[PDB]
Design a protein around this ligand. Sequence first.
Ligand SMILES: Oc1cccc(O)c1
Ligand SMILES: Oc1cccc(O)c1
Ligand SMILES: Oc1cccc(O)c1
Ligand SMILES: Oc1cccc(O)c1
Ligand SMILES: Oc1cccc(O)c1
Ligand SMILES: Oc1cccc(O)c1
Ligand SMILES: [Zn+2]
Ligand SMILES: [Zn+2]
Lengths: 21, 21, 21, 21, 21, 21, 29, 29, 28, 28, 29, 29
Amino acid sequence: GIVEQCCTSICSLYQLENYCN
Amino acid sequence: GIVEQCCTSICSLYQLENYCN
Amino acid sequence: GIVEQCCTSICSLYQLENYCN
Amino acid sequence: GIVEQCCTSICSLYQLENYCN
Amino acid sequence: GIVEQCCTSICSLYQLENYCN
Amino acid sequence: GIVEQCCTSICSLYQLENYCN
Amino acid sequence: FVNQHLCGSHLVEALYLVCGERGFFYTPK
Amino acid sequence: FVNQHLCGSHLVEALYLVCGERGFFYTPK
Amino acid sequence: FVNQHLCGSHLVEALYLVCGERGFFYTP
Amino acid sequence: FVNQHLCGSHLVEALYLVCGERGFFYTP
Amino acid sequence: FVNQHLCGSHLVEALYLVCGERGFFYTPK
Amino acid sequence: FVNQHLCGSHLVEALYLVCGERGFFYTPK
Ligand SMILES: Oc1cccc(O)c1
Ligand SMILES: Oc1cccc(O)c1
Ligand SMILES: Oc1cccc(O)c1
Ligand SMILES: Oc1cccc(O)c1
Ligand SMILES: Oc1cccc(O)c1
Ligand SMILES: Oc1cccc(O)c1
Ligand SMILES: [Zn+2]
Ligand SMILES: [Zn+2]
């Protein structure tokens, strides 16, 4: 999930924020 | 400076944007 | 919570595991 | 050594404990 | 730049010191 | 020791070098 | 390789800063 | 001083290492 | 003191994250 | 690339420590 | 090799965590 | 507070950087 999205390519701040509560 | 502003209370990432080039 | 428990005193690794999924 | 054991595949914390004093 | 120079072969503290103000 | 010396006052990298092997 | 393991450590530190008081769930697989 | 803020940064890294494949939830508030 | 030194480490990490391709200048 | 991104994180931390009071610029 | 350099940084962090008051020896050879 | 504990985390990262392949022992007590 996040590991595939954010460790294959650099996630932007926006993309990261999707994972917050 | 940044140490007085942001080590005494929490700076948001938006506040921190001010220090970017 | 974790901040009350583990920022007041050092939490053991077993204490930290309470917050694993 | 640690680099050979643990930089090529993931070592658990228990595995890493072999390097504690 | 620093990424180019520093990011495949390891840069020494001396080498990094070149990037200081 | 190192904690007493360097967590009470900031040790420079040179001073820290004093604790290497 | 340990690349993904190392990446995850940076990922969680980034999530920490982005999410603030909201926190987050990290569920790697 | 920003005690709890910096504490949290370390907490998430510790949780990352301890929890492994389980992942974790960071819920400060 | 040591607190401010530790804080600065975290500041640079945050600036790295937030500034992205813009980069940043840091001074204590 | 992710490689370079993670490298940069460590570079800025190293620069923080090496440069001390002088500070530093990061560009990447 | 930069990858090994970055690996060692993360190893030392994990050793600090798991070893506690014992501390550790980081001897990369 | 856990500032001394967190100082240690930063200290070992700095030792890692400075010592290089010299390595180091960390003996917190
Ligand atoms: O995609 C990522 C991975 C790690 C840190 C980060 O800021 C972004
Ligand atoms: O106020 C602060 C201090 C250090 C890191 C950070 O993201 C914010
Ligand atoms: O209580 C704590 C706080 C931060 C890191 C850690 O391993 C334990
Ligand atoms: O195998 C490893 C390498 C680096 C950090 C870690 O926790 C495990
Ligand atoms: O070449 C490098 C890359 C990252 C950190 C460092 O100290 C050196
Ligand atoms: O005195 C210290 C304590 C922790 C990190 C460091 O670079 C110096
Ligand atoms: Zn810290
Ligand atoms: Zn890393």
